[PDB]
Design a protein around this ligand. Structure first.
Ligand SMILES: [Cl-]
Ligand SMILES: [Cl-]
Ligand SMILES: [Cl-]
Ligand SMILES: [Cl-]
Ligand SMILES: [Cl-]
Ligand SMILES: [Cl-]
Ligand SMILES: [Cl-]
Ligand SMILES: [Cl-]
Ligand SMILES: [Cl-]
Ligand SMILES: [Mg+2]
Ligand SMILES: [Zn+2]
Ligand SMILES: [Zn+2]
Ligand SMILES: [Zn+2]
Lengths: 221, 221, 221
């Protein structure tokens, strides 16, 4: 369904070119990983970089994943910079329901991110307020890793929860997604796919990798 | 003496072009302001952006100003990414002498940053171990601001301390530096000048602004 | 004057034996470095170990150096466990004067610890309330290190301050103190000497090292 390349793997010296080209190559969203050196042991890119992409002319959805703690102060800055989706980790907010409301009140689409160990019942009382749930299939902020197999089982659980809600909620997956496992991940229930190194560091073009990913997703459904 | 444009004001969609052009226009260093959303209320750019500039072919000194707390974990990442100078705020480290030693042990040039209110006696026992002292003439992380006049008096104090040490220590200034005040700032003792919006958002070219700054500095000495 | 071996370097499988033997060998105090994994990146020993030495029959002064933050909660536990001196880092307490008063109110002797970079003016308004000032000549919590030469100059400054106060205040030194530099350190003004590896990991007996240290201090005064 939706392909959302992570730009952590792109050439940050020519970020506008990279984003322009990956969207032309078939990507739907720009996935924007924000790390504050506290919630995870790395520091990446803040609102000014999102704003720069909008000023450069990017009109595709920008999907901002906040690996930061606390989260509320920076959310208005990402809204002002032109974020489309803003997702966050419930452990990183003292008032999860308020953080969701804040994102929505600014005109952005709120998402919740589940770390690999995070139990699904944190969705019990907020799921209907969400536009997106992201399951991490690697540990965020710890670099290039292999897909964690239990994410396939957790995807099936959250897919059932979203389907039972009757709401249009994206089910996103991030971590070690590549051409040769995206079919199984789609069959498990994901419909929004974040890939970084598999696209930006491929031996073939961005368009070839994205086309293979789509073909593999279509064949598995 | 040295011109160190802050890339926070540059076009981050074409960062390599901006840096290439500002260096061609007469800049000496790339000044790299790193904010972690905790030490200051903003989040900017991390080690991956420094690495990207090195991979792009930038060979000029990269001057990394850490507005982060704590500081020690990220310092090796900036060293590996190709930082030349790494400066930090002593308030942000529990063991200032160790943090300096760490920077030096990685082959980088350590600096200490004094916020506008920070008394100079934090230099008492570390000055001889430094390659750079940076005085902030705006409050860091709070945006485009006007030069704080007390910075001129503090520059004179720190110039005397550096001169009395006999060591080769840069005296850097950052905040609201522009063509029409850089002469007075140089006369107060600074020899390394950080400017952001005055260069990257100027109504004339980067080369014109930098040439005026140099002429104004030369006329004031 | 006073020798205070640091038991961090002792054999913790036979701590009572080690402490008994080093006091029998001529040591005056038991120096007790307490690290909470937060103020420094290591965790050592808490009040229960102090209590075990008292229960074992140790009657010499136990000199507790708190490298912990915050400090007030654990101070009554060290007093109850039989600490004699309790020293702490002013940076680790939000109310340095109160922390001193708390130590004194429990019948213990309060000390202030200066890290290598810490300016001496933190002593300005509390020095008369202290029984001890400790200068760190290594970075605390970062392991076996070499004596930082600037500690000799800071000892001379703090020696003058204590002498001008007219109060009986110990001037303690900790970090890389060994037989071949203890003379110079004493000449700089220290009268209370913490050594760890030089005593407990020495190639000669405790009684020989302590006698050599004492002879070297006497010859330097
Ligand atoms: Cl709200
Ligand atoms: Cl986890
Ligand atoms: Cl990462
Ligand atoms: Cl080190
Ligand atoms: Cl300030
Ligand atoms: Cl800012
Ligand atoms: Cl009290
Ligand atoms: Cl220090
Ligand atoms: Cl240690
Ligand atoms: Mg539960
Ligand atoms: Zn992400
Ligand atoms: Zn700066
Ligand atoms: Zn100690």
């Amino acid at each position: 369904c939706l392909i959302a390349p992570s730009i952590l793997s792109a050439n940050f010296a020519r970020l506008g070119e990279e984003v322009d080209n990956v969207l032309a190559a078939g990507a739907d969203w720009v996935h924007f990983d924000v790390m504050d050196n506290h919630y995870v042991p790395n520091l990446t890119i803040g609102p000014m970089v999102c704003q720069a992409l909008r000023k450069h002319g990017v009109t595709a959805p920008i999907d901002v994943h906040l690996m930061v703690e606390p989260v509320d102060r920076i959310i208005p800055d990402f809204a002002e910079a032109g974020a489309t989706y803003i997702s966050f980790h419930p452990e990183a907010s003292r008032h999860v329901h308020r953080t969701i409301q804040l994102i929505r009140s600014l005109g952005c689409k709120p998402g919740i991110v589940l770390n690999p160990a995070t139990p699904v019942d944190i969705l019990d009382w907020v799921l209907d307020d969400l536009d997106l749930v992201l399951l991490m299939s690697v540990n965020p902020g710890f670099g290039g890793q292999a897909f964690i197999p239990s994410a396939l089982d957790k995807l099936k659980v959250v897919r059932k929860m979203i389907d039972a809600s009757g709401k249009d909620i994206r089910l996103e997956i991030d971590g070690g997604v590549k051409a040769d496992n995206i079919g199984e991940i789609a069959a498990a229930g994901a419909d929004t796919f974040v890939a970084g190194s598999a696209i930006f560091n491929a031996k073939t073009s961005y368009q070839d990798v994205i086309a293979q990913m789509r073909a593999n997703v279509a064949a598995a459904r």
